[PDB]
Each structure stands twice: as structure tokens, then as C-alpha cells.
């Protein structure tokens, strides 16, 4: 498990820090990654920090962000200087399909997913996630993420295929095309909610803009 730390409110240009606290046993994936999301807009990939200790960082934020590490206390850190009223927004950390429950920080390649999709109980879906410089191979990772109101995000697939624990059967993904594809298989209404796609891009994570798929 995961859970994020921040100060809660912030001044504008002056710094933000967070502290995500990792516990438990297992440690799936290959390090830490922060993400946020601004009120009522999308995710945005912030950074990573890998097992070795090496970051990758999100470039059009490069400049103002740092991401360190303390082995000892099992944490990961996020600083981000010169906060702008734009940086207002919900801070997770994230590691593998398995997300932190997100603080709220309030200031004092394109990938394209279908942006809404309705469907019946016991029905199948396929939900989307194009890239516009290419095709999506495995070589792109592809994890789908699902929000279930409000807030909270789950991991559903990553590795393009790999079900996640404790994820129902009827969620399979796939490649269609030059596409990266999550098929429901038999939706229910527990599924309506919102699903966002990421592609690894060699350094760097892209969200979609996710899908909010109805199940009437
Ligand atoms: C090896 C090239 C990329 N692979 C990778 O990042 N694997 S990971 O640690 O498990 C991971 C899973 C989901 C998210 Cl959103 C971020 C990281």
C-alpha cells in the first residue's frame, strides 16, 4: 500500500512537498511514479523513480520538479518549486497498477481514448487508447487505469495483457489494430465508471483522456 502526504495548501511560487510512505510485503513493478490530476480535468504523469534510484521526469515540468528516495524510511519524495495556481490539483503516488489514495493540493505524443461509451448489463465492450505518433506495440506497456467515483484509482491491466490481482475475470487487454484495447466481457453495473489508458513512451508515461463508460 501507498499514501501520499502534503501540506495540504500551498503558496503560490513558493514550494510543494510530498512524501509517499510505501508499506507491505510485495513491490510489483519497477518503481514509484507521481501523477495528479487537477480539478475536473485529467491525469497528468509527473515523474518516476526507478528501484536503481534513477527519475525520469515529465519534461514539460522537468524544470521545476525534484523526485529523491529514502531507503530507510521507505518513502519516496515529490518537490516541485515556483507553485503556480495551474498546480492545484489531487498528487498520487503510484507503483505498478497499485495507486495511493491521493492528496489534494490547493494553491493559495497525444494518446486518445473514446471520451464517453454506454452499454447494457451482460453486454460486451471495448474501450480504445490510440497514440498519434504510431501504432501501440507491447513495447508501450499499455495500463489501464480505473477511477471508481470519486477519486480512488485502480489498476486494472498493465503490460498491455496482465490482469491484475483481484480483477474480475470479464477485463481482458489486448492490441486491436494500432491500438491498445480493454474489453469488458458481460458488463455490469459495477464497471460504470472511468478508465484511463497510459503509454510508456521509452522515458515517459501519457495518460488518456479516459472514458466514462455508462452501464445503463
Ligand atoms: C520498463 C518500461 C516501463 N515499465 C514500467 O514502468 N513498469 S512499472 O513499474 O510496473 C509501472 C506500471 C504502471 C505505471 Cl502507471 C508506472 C510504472
Known amino acids: 500500500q501507498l499514501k501520499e502526504s502534503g501540506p495540504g495548501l500551498v503558496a503560490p511560487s513558493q514550494s510543494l512537498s510530498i512524501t509517499c510512505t510505501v508499506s507491505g510485503l510485495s513491490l510489483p513493478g519497477y518503481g514509484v511514479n507521481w501523477v495528479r490530476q487537477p480539478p475536473g480535468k485529467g491525469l497528468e504523469w509527473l515523474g518516476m523513480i526507478w528501484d536503481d534510484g534513477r527519475t525520469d521526469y515529465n519534461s514539460a515540468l522537468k524544470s521545476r520538479l525534484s523526485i529523491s528516495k529514502d531507503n530507510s524510511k521507505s518513502q519516496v519524495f515529490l518537490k516541485m518549486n515556483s507553485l503556480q495556481t495551474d498546480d492545484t490539483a489531487r498528487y498520487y503516488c503510484?507503483?505498478?497498477?497499485?495507486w495511493g489514495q491521493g492528496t489534494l493540493v490547493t494553491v493559495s505524443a497525444v494518446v486518445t481514448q473514446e471520451s464517453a461509451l454506454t452499454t447494457s448489463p451482460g453486454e460486451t465492450v471495448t474501450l480504445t487508447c490510440r497514440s498519434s505518433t504510431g501504432a501501440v506495440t507491447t513495447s508501450n506497456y499499455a495500463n489501464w487505469v480505473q477511477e471508481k467515483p470519486d477519486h480512488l484509482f485502480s489498476g486494472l491491466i498493465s503490460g498491455t495483457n496482465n490482469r491484475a490481482p483481484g480483477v474480475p475475470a470479464r477485463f481482458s487487454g489486448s492490441l486491436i489494430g494500432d491500438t491498445a484495447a480493454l474489453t469488458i466481457t458481460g458488463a455490469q453495473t459495477e464497471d460504470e465508471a472511468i478508465y484511463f489508458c497510459?503509454?510508456?513512451?521509452?522515458?515517459?508515461?501519457?495518460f488518456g483522456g479516459g472514458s466514462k463508460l455508462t452501464v445503463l
Open positions: 503510484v507503483r505498478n497498477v497499485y
Open positions: 497510459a503509454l510508456w513512451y521509452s522515458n515517459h508515461w501519457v
